[PDB]
Amino acid sequence: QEESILQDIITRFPNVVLMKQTAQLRAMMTIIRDKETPKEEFVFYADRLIRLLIEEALNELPFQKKEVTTPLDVSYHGVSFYSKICGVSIVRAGESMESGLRAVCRGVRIGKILIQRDETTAEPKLIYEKLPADIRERWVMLLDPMCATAGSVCKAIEVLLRLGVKEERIIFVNILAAPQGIERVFKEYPKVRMVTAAVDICLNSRYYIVPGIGDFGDRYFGTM
């Protein structure tokens, strides 16, 4: 069933990359999804999974062949990454992923975007943003752990595009998504790439992914 939903997403959206479903990955999701898990643990496993996810996402960047010579004096043919990048987090949940990106990409520039749906209208509105000046020339790792209706990420993408970022240079790094959110992102910006660790079955009236994980943001920052 999951397999079916998984395969369907996979054949329908060539631009999505699902992390390999290893037993460890599932053990981690198990801990974080459990409502019984304590904050310290949740944080620990969340950070652990984020590192893997980020490492996976970094493979979507472009690279060049590069040849070097070993200390044994023989050549080795490698493949360097030479592009300019930055991370852009969706406050506040996406900020939880910043440490992971910074752990592997030392001193990478981090932009931040704060968006909030209108109480009545539901239109996500941009409340605040601080981004690198030359973001237009960069590849961007857009971070947001949950992608439910996809309203916030679509708005985040809209502003990036307005700023001049090329759609095909956007890599959306996500932990958990709902098929519905995935479909919206691709209907609106077919050129972006998305990397996620899991696809659930549905979304509820309150807009939570199910079986899901609850509110990632409060669980992670402990404001629940």
Cα distance between residue 144 and residue 152, in whole Å: 9
Determine which one of 118, 121, 206, 223 is catalytic.
Answer: 121
Under the binding rule (CB under 8 A), the answer on residue 3 touching its own copies is: no
Our answer to whether residue 218 is catalytic in this structure is yes
Angle at 87 between CA 140 and CA 28, to 5 degrees: 110
Provide the minimum distance between the beta carbon of 80 and its own copies in the complex, in angstroms, as a whole number: 6
Site for its own copies in 88-107 (CB under 8 A): 91-92, 95, 99, 102, 104, 106-107
Chosen residue from 36, 118, 120, 162 binding its own copies by CB under 8 A: 36
Under the binding rule (CB under 8 A), the answer on residue 163 touching its own copies is: no
Our answer to whether residue 70 is catalytic in this structure is no
Contact between 195 and 57 under an 8 Å Cβ cutoff? The reply is yes
Under the binding rule (CB under 8 A), the answer on residue 137 touching its own copies is: no
216 among the known binding-site residues? Answer: yes
Under the binding rule (CB under 8 A), the answer on residue 13 touching its own copies is: no
Under the binding rule (CB under 8 A), the answer on residue 27 touching its own copies is: yes
Number of residues this chain uses to bind its own copies (CB under 8 A): 79
**Residues designated as active site:** 117, 121, 215, 218
Enumerate the known binding-site residues: 39, 48, 82-85, 92, 109, 117, 138, 144-152, 209, 214-216
